[PDB]
C-alpha cells in the first residue's frame, strides 16, 4: 500500500541549491519518522538527516547548516533542501519511513555536484 | 564507534540456501532495531527483515516463509537464513542498526549472487 515517490534531483554547479521532497502515499496508519539516506559512487549508505514523528530533528554532523530538512503533513511530503552542495554530496539519494516496525524506501533521485 | 561488521555473502545457485551475520561492535544504547536491507537490481533498495529489542520480528511479504531473522544477544550477532533463493533475492545485502527513542548505521555490504 505504502509508496514513496521522490524528485527535485540533479546536476549543479558546485555551491548550487535543490530541494528534494518525498511524497507520501497510502495508508501508515500512524504518523512515521523520515530519514534521508544517501549513496556516493562507489559506497555504503549514510544517514544524512531525519524528522521524528512528534518533530524531532537530527542531522548529520557532516551537513549542518547547508541541509535543512521540514515535513508538511498535509500534503504528507517530506523535504530536504540542500544549499552549499559541495562534490563530497553526489550521490543517490533516498528517502525512508518508520511507521511493528514496518519500513519503506523511495527508488532514489541522483545528485552529482560539478 | 559502532562498527556493523556484515558476512556470509557470497554465490549460490538456485533453490540452495545461505545465512548471513551482522556483527555488532561498540553500542552503548539500549537495545536497537537491527534489520537488513538489500539493494537488488530490477527492484531498487527494499527492507527484508528486521528485529526490533523485545523481540518483535517483522518480514517483508516477499520473503516470509523463505527468510528467518535472530539474534545472539550474547555474541551481540545477527543472523538471516535465506532458504530457497531465487534468482530474484540477488543483489547487495546490508543491515543496519537504529538505537533511538533516530540514529541509525549501516555496514559495508555483503553480495549475494543467485546463480
Known amino acids: 500500500?505504502?509508496?514513496?515517490?521522490?524528485?527535485?534531483?540533479?546536476?549543479?554547479?558546485?555551491?548550487?541549491?535543490?530541494?528534494?521532497?518525498?511524497?507520501?502515499?497510502?495508508?501508515?496508519?500512524?504518523?512515521?519518522?523520515?530519514?534521508?539516506?544517501?549513496?556516493?559512487?562507489?559506497?555504503?549508505?549514510?544517514?544524512?538527516?531525519?524528522?521524528?514523528?512528534?518533530?524531532?530533528?537530527?542531522?548529520?554532523?557532516?551537513?549542518?547548516?547547508?541541509?535543512?530538512?521540514?515535513?508538511?503533513?498535509?500534503?504528507?511530503?517530506?523535504?530536504?533542501?540542500?544549499?552549499?552542495?559541495?562534490?563530497?554530496?553526489?550521490?543517490?539519494?533516498?528517502?525512508?519511513?518508520?511507521?511493528?516496525?514496518?519500513?519503506?524506501?523511495?527508488?532514489?533521485?541522483?545528485?552529482?555536484?560539478? | 564507534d559502532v562498527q556493523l561488521v556484515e558476512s556470509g555473502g557470497g554465490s549460490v545457485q538456485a533453490g540452495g540456501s545461505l545465512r548471513l551475520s551482522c556483527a555488532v561492535s561498540?553500542?552503548?544504547?539500549?537495545?536497537?532495531?537491527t534489520g537488513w536491507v538489500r539493494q537488488a537490481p530490477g527492484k531498487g533498495l527494499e527492507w527484508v527483515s528486521s528485529?526490533?529489542?523485545?523481540?518483535?520480528?517483522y518480514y517483508q511479504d516477499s520473503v516470509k516463509g523463505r527468510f528467518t531473522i535472530s539474534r545472539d544477544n550474547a555474541k551481540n550477532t545477527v543472523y538471516l537464513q535465506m532458504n530457497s533463493l531465487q534468482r530474484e533475492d540477488t543483489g547487495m545485502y546490508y543491515c543496519?542498526?537504529?538505537?533511538?527513542?533516530?540514529?541509525?548505521?549501516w555496514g559495508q555490504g555483503t553480495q549475494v549472487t543467485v546463480s
Open positions: 543496519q542498526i537504529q538505537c533511538g527513542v533516530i540514529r541509525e548505521y
Open positions: 561498540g553500542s552503548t544504547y539500549s537495545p536497537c532495531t
Open positions: 528485529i526490533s529489542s523485545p523481540g518483535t520480528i
